[PDB]
Write a structure and sequence with these properties.
The complex is a heterodimer of chains A (39) and B (156).
Chain A (H helix, E strand, L loop, with lengths): L1 E7 L8 E2 L5 E6 L5 E3 L2
Antiparallel strand pairs in A: 3-4
Chain B lengths: L5 E7 L6 E9 L2 E4 L1 H4 L4 E3 L2 E3 L1 E5 L4 E4 L15 E5 L7 E5 L2 E5 L2 E6 L11 E3 L5 E4 L3 E3 L5 E4 L7
Antiparallel strand pairs in B: 1-2, 2-3, 3-7, 4-5, 6-7, 8-9, 8-12, 10-11, 11-15, 12-13, 14-15
Classes of the chains: A mainly beta (39), B mainly beta (156).
Bound molecules: 4-(2-hydroxyethyl)-5-methyl-1,2-dihydro-3H-pyrazol-3-one.
The site of 4-(2-hydroxyethyl)-5-methyl-1,2-dihydro-3H-pyrazol-3-one has 7 residues of chain B, from loops.
């Protein structure tokens, strides 16, 4: 049995930690909702 | 139960202790999460009950108490923020420039940030604080890294 608990407001934080790259990938999406790489 | 707008953890007491299986967004009285988090099961909020209203395994999304309300989209140019809510840890904003998932049916924004599975459902926001999608359905690329789609539903 699942339950929910509040974790915070949804707001943009000025001067948040900036990380992560921006890859451009060819992908496929199957009927089960699973993404996979296309090569 | 609690219906204030905001981000929420999705918990279960079925396994050892209390385990966080995911995250979701409450907006306009509707709770939005990813299908793989709840598998369409009913949810509890205090003494109240939330029943599923719409869901789709292929989109990997589900809404409770009403139809999907989130309709903002990534502009394809700007940095966004993942409002990550990891298991047992405080909510934290991470800013990033999304990459792209190119599919036979069009392009989708993607966030190259790696968090525990129980973080699935965390919202990705634009500079106006609007939810442009949920984090947690993606792919593992060559170097073993994780890249999530920016998954957004349709507002009827
Ligand atoms: C398997 C899975 N689904 N969503 C997630 O965030 C993960 C773990 C990768 O950090």
């Amino acid at each position: 049995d699942m339950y929910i608990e509040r974790a915070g407001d949804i707001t943009w934080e000025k001067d948040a930690e900036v990380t992560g790259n921006s890859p451009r990938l060819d992908v496929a999406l199957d009927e089960s909702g699973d993404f996979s790489l296309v090569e | 139960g609690e219906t204030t707008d905001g981000v929420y953890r999705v918990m279960t007491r079925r396994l050892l202790g209390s385990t966080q299986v995911g995250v979701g967004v409450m907006q306009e009285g509707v709770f939005h999460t990813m299908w793989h988090v709840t598998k369409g099961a009913a949810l509890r909020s205090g003494e109240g009950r939330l029943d599923p209203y719409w869901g789709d395994v292929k989109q990997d999304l589900v809404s409770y108490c009403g139809p999907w309300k989130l309709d903002a989209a990534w502009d394809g140019l700007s940095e966004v923020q993942l409002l990550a809510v990891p298991p047992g840890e405080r909510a934290k904003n991470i800013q990033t420039l999304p990459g792209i998932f190119k599919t036979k049916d069009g392009d989708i924004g993607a966030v190259a940030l790696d968090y525990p599975a129980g973080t699935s459902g965390s919202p990705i926001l634009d500079k106006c604080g609007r939810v442009i999608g949920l984090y947690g359905n993606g792919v593992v690329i060559k170097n073993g890294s994780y890249v999530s789609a920016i998954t957004q539903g349709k507002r009827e």
